[PDB]
Design an enzyme around this catalytic site. Structure first.
Site, PDB file in Angstrom:
ATOM      1  N   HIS A   1       0.830  -1.236   0.000  1.00 13.45           N
ATOM      2  CA  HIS A   1       0.000   0.000   0.000  1.00 13.45           C
ATOM      3  C   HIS A   1       0.864   1.286   0.000  1.00 13.45           C
ATOM      4  O   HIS A   1       0.289   2.387  -0.186  1.00 13.45           O
ATOM      5  CB  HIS A   1      -1.073  -0.084   1.105  1.00 13.45           C
ATOM      6  CG  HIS A   1      -0.570   0.108   2.496  1.00 13.45           C
ATOM      7  ND1 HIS A   1      -0.451  -0.940   3.387  1.00 13.45           N
ATOM      8  CD2 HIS A   1      -0.194   1.228   3.163  1.00 13.45           C
ATOM      9  CE1 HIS A   1       0.011  -0.469   4.535  1.00 13.45           C
ATOM     10  NE2 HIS A   1       0.173   0.861   4.412  1.00 13.45           N
TER      11      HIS A   1
ATOM     12  N   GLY B   1       1.113   5.550  10.898  1.00  9.25           N
ATOM     13  CA  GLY B   1       2.545   5.908  10.985  1.00  9.25           C
ATOM     14  C   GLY B   1       3.428   4.699  11.284  1.00  9.25           C
ATOM     15  O   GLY B   1       4.655   4.801  11.065  1.00  9.25           O
TER      16      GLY B   1
ATOM     17  N   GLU C   1       0.793  -8.467   0.643  1.00 11.08           N
ATOM     18  CA  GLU C   1       1.007  -7.084   1.157  1.00 11.08           C
ATOM     19  C   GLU C   1       2.491  -6.728   1.355  1.00 11.08           C
ATOM     20  O   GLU C   1       2.769  -5.714   1.995  1.00 11.08           O
ATOM     21  CB  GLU C   1       0.196  -6.855   2.446  1.00 11.08           C
ATOM     22  CG  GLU C   1       0.044  -5.386   2.815  1.00 11.08           C
ATOM     23  CD  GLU C   1      -0.621  -4.527   1.745  1.00 11.08           C
ATOM     24  OE1 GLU C   1      -1.281  -5.103   0.838  1.00 11.08           O
ATOM     25  OE2 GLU C   1      -0.439  -3.289   1.781  1.00 11.08           O
TER      26      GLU C   1
ATOM     27  N   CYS D   1       3.014   1.532   9.845  1.00 11.76           N
ATOM     28  CA  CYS D   1       3.138   0.554   8.731  1.00 11.76           C
ATOM     29  C   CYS D   1       4.590   0.527   8.240  1.00 11.76           C
ATOM     30  O   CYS D   1       5.206   1.622   8.083  1.00 11.76           O
ATOM     31  CB  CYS D   1       2.148   0.795   7.597  1.00 11.76           C
ATOM     32  SG  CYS D   1       0.443   0.519   8.142  1.00 11.76           S
TER      33      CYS D   1
END
Length: 182
Positions: free
Chosen positions: A41, A146, A72, A148
């Site tokens: 992402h 903040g 991911e 990730c």
């Protein structure tokens, strides 16, 4: 404070950079040579900022498992003039549960942050921001925006990178040794 935080500090000090994309600032784990990971992402393009240095991206691969399901995890090769310490011998080989994990973050916003998140469940399937995702680790800490890309360690192992949360729980994508065979 203890051997948990000691292992985590050893990873952060030598094996992380601050990655900036158009989707914000991320903790980014360097694994070996010029190869690093970041949550998918982050939407890595042709250029990325690494510790505020404009960096060409030589390759970027959004990993999916053999069921063709999102993991991911994006693997990035950077056009950087320096190699990372090779930490592949610290990656687990199989999917597993763990005890006493630390989640470590380093950005502008959250410098030198270390969270004891406790027990880690092999959760598996998660609908993550509406995307079916596999190989998810779950821990009972109310993680926030903040964090990730934050690195999840146990003493002796780098087990995942933080990819989201629901306000009660946080979620990490597993790192496996087989992702980084050269």
């Amino acid at each position: 404070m203890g051997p948990g935080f000691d292992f985590a500090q050893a990873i952060m000090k030598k094996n992380t950079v601050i990655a900036r994309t158009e989707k914000g600032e991320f903790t980014m784990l360097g694994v070996y040579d010029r190869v690093a990971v970041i949550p998918t992402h982050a939407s890595v393009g042709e250029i990325i900022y690494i510790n505020d240095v404009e960096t060409r991206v030589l390759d970027a691969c959004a990993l999916r498992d053999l069921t063709d399901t999102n993991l991911e995890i994006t693997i990035v090769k950077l056009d950087r003039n320096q190699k990372f310490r090779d930490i592949r011998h610290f990656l687990p080989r199989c999917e597993d549960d763990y005890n006493d994990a630390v989640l470590s973050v380093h950005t502008s916003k959250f410098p030198n942050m270390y969270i004891p998140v406790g027990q880690v469940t092999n959760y598996g399937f998660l609908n993550l921001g509406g995307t079916p995702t596999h190989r998810i680790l779950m821990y009972n800490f109310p993680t926030r925006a903040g964090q990730c890309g934050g690195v999840v360690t146990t003493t002796g192992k780098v087990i995942g990178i933080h990819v989201g949360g629901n306000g009660a729980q946080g979620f990490a994508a597993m790192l496996l040794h087989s992702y980084f065979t050269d």
